[PDB]
Design a protein around this nucleic acid. Sequence first.
DNA 1: CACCCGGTCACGTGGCCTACA
DNA 2: GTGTAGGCCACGTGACCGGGT
Lengths: 65, 65
Amino acid sequence: MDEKRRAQHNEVERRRRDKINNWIVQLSKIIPDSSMESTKSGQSKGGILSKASDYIQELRQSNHR
Amino acid sequence: MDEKRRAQHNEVERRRRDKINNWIVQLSKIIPDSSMESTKSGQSKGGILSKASDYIQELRQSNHR
DNA sequence: CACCCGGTCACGTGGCCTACA
DNA sequence: GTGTAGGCCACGTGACCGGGT
């Protein structure tokens, strides 16, 4: 029953990126952004990064460390 | 022909590509003295997110949550 | 020095949506 | 209606560590 162990495949990587998916979703929702509108608001944080960054600079700057 | 109407996108895709690694460190730095050690080149992303999720959590707590 | 290793990074593909002319 | 160039996002490869036994 040919079942190679060559398993430095599918399970390995998306475990990574997938990780980076749940830290971004923070900012996005929690960073009032410029993410347009059309039918039921489903477009992404590459329409956020635009805004995102902003609050954070002007939040470190004036107060943290 | 269906020439190049996507082959351009090849270049134009790295466009936001280095939207996604340059807006990365650049923003991804004013928060906590990291250092993941670099060289003539050198890795970086991930954590900056994860740690800027708890300061995000303290000065997002801003108003005073 | 020896390689089997996870780790993570990018960069190059498609596909899925959306407006405009 | 009637296709353009454009938006993003999801997966792949393949560099390149660091590191064990």
